[PDB]
Scaffold this motif. Structure first.
Motif, PDB file in Angstrom:
ATOM      1  N   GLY A 172       0.808  -1.203   0.000  1.00 42.40           N
ATOM      2  CA  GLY A 172       0.000   0.000   0.000  1.00 42.40           C
ATOM      3  C   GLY A 172       0.848   1.263   0.000  1.00 42.40           C
TER       4      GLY A 172
ATOM      5  N   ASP B 176       1.921  -1.604  -4.535  1.00 36.80           N
ATOM      6  CA  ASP B 176       0.611  -0.966  -4.514  1.00 36.80           C
ATOM      7  C   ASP B 176      -0.210  -1.473  -5.697  1.00 36.80           C
ATOM      8  N   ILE B 177      -1.525  -1.430  -5.566  1.00 37.75           N
ATOM      9  CA  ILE B 177      -2.408  -1.776  -6.671  1.00 37.75           C
ATOM     10  C   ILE B 177      -2.449  -0.672  -7.747  1.00 37.75           C
TER      11      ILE B 177
ATOM     12  N   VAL C  81       0.887  -4.728  -7.298  1.00 35.24           N
ATOM     13  CA  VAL C  81       0.374  -5.935  -6.659  1.00 35.24           C
ATOM     14  C   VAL C  81      -0.995  -5.655  -6.033  1.00 35.24           C
TER      15      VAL C  81
ATOM     16  N   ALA D  14      -1.192  -2.287   3.298  1.00 32.70           N
ATOM     17  CA  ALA D  14      -2.292  -2.219   2.340  1.00 32.70           C
ATOM     18  C   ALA D  14      -3.653  -2.349   3.045  1.00 32.70           C
TER      19      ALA D  14
HETATM   20 CL   LIG Z   1      -2.381  -1.495  -2.426  1.00 35.09          CL
END
Ligand SMILES: [Cl-]
Ligand SMILES: C[C@]12CC[C@@H](O)C[C@@H]1CC[C@@H]1[C@@H]2CC[C@]2(C)C(=O)CC[C@@H]12
Ligand SMILES: C[C@]12CC[C@@H](O)C[C@@H]1CC[C@@H]1[C@@H]2CC[C@]2(C)C(=O)CC[C@@H]12
Ligand SMILES: [Cl-]
Ligand SMILES: [Cl-]
Ligand SMILES: [Cl-]
Ligand SMILES: [Cl-]
Ligand SMILES: [Cl-]
Lengths: 243, 242
Positions: A14, A38-39, A63, A92
């Motif tokens: 995150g 991070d997404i 990720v 995250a």
């Molecule tokens: Cl994330």
């Protein structure tokens, strides 16, 4: 007082926004080797560029920490390309979309996938090498900065869960005499007080994101097991929005 | 000191074995109308038969509490065929396969699905009618040996379930829903941790009938928390792998 983390491989989930982003900046200043997950690719890249400016070596991976297989495939790449993680920061958190009745349950599930189960998967990935070297630090970040009423129960429950993960893991490491792997948990006060008994959970005062991270970093660097902070969950006002 | 629960519709999950079964019997004696849920048809029918022998009206449903859709489907049947549940006992717990014969990760997931997420689904199914009527009782049973691979998941799930109870309790209070009560059966380790509390490794512990006695007394006096010593033999479980 404070340990050196220079050259340590620090992985932060995150890291593209919020506390995770600010935490990455603090480790950058300390000249750790950073692995940022991070997404969100854009947020991730912003964090990474600033960390480089701060003087750190930095690697990034996009990720989705709701996806166990993504976590493991990415961990495999970290081990092969970068090395063994020594500080794991499980930060995250779930991000809610709609409030609507019909779409709540998948997001309640996702709340536990990200806020709790992800910590199992990263620990399974990275703790074995820490144990082998008797050197590591697992940081459970169970505070995050407003959540709509349908998700309040899931969100709060998931934080009790994460704190339980920390407490149990801490004692397992101790039982196994794994003396070199430390644990630190950033914990909302509500896990000790509940909500109604603690007016601050509705009224504040609360902390700025910078203050949260200052306290987190101090705890990590002095190897404190627990760091309690006031949440900004705004309990009663969140609930009055139905009444 | 104790309320009557005569004619209350009491739904117990995991009612085909263990403390769920023993709890069903106690409610049977108090003349509640029982709704029993369990994944095992025979255990379920056995419990039901004895509840009927004790004089109570009883209905059974085979339900996989890891499956949200099954919970909701079965709840719809309960509402239509029986009525509105007034006491919900969330007791079902995950059952593990040795990691000698199964992968770990799906079972860690299942731990949370059954021990935590099921409580969300049953609460979403049954709490609305309780709130509408301002009458209900949600019982979070967060006490139930576990091998090292599953110990972390198992323990964390109990912290989670206690957190569920505490948050739900305060939501109801905040909304001034005075007639819906909550009770949680909670292992001491949630307050003490493990190493700080030698009983988590050494006991003494309670027999199942004692656990049920304390559960029933707490429910009937509408206690919010009932702390009990667990029997997870923490240190010996772990030190075994050294
Ligand atoms: Cl994330
Ligand atoms: C330390 C130990 C057990 C001792 C040694 O084999 C290393 C492993 C590393 C992963 C750990 C495991 C104990 C159980 C743990 C903590 C879990 O439940 C997830 C990660 C697991
Ligand atoms: C019941 C038990 C052992 C008890 C519990 O962990 C479930 C498993 C399920 C697979 C079984 C196993 C006993 C040994 C068996 C029968 C084998 O050798 C292959 C499958 C194995
Ligand atoms: Cl994520
Ligand atoms: Cl708080
Ligand atoms: Cl049981
Ligand atoms: Cl496995
Ligand atoms: Cl205990």
């Amino acid at each position: 007082r404070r340990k050196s983390v220079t050259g340590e491989i620090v992985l932060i989930t995150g890291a593209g926004h919020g506390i995770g982003r600010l935490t990455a900046y603090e480790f950058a200043k300390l000249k750790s080797k950073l692995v940022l997950w991070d997404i969100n690719k854009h947020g991730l890249e912003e964090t990474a560029a600033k960390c480089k400016g701060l003087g750190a070596k930095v690697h990034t991976f996009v990720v989705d920490c709701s996806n166990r297989e993504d976590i493991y495939s990415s961990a495999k790449k970290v081990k092969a390309e970068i090395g063994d993680v020594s500080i794991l920061v499980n930060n995250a958190g779930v991000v809610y979309t709609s409030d609507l009745f019909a779409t709540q349950d998948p997001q309640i599930e996702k709340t536990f996938e990200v806020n709790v189960l992800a910590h199992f998967w990263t620990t399974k990935a990275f703790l074995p090498a820490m144990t082998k070297n008797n050197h590591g630090h697992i940081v459970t970040v169970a505070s995050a900065a407003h959540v709509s009423v349908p998700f309040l129960l899931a969100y709060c429950s998931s934080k009790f869960a994460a704190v339980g993960f920390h407490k149990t893991l801490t004692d397992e490491l101790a039982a196994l005499q794994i003396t070199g792997v430390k644990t630190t948990c950033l914990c909302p006060n509500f896990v000790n007080t509940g909500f109604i008994k603690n007016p601050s959970t509705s009224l504040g005062p609360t902390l700025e994101p910078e203050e949260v991270v200052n306290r987190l970093m101090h705890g990590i660097l002095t190897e404190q097991k627990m760091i309690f902070i006031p949440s900004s969950i705004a309990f009663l006002t969140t609930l009055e929005r139905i009444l």
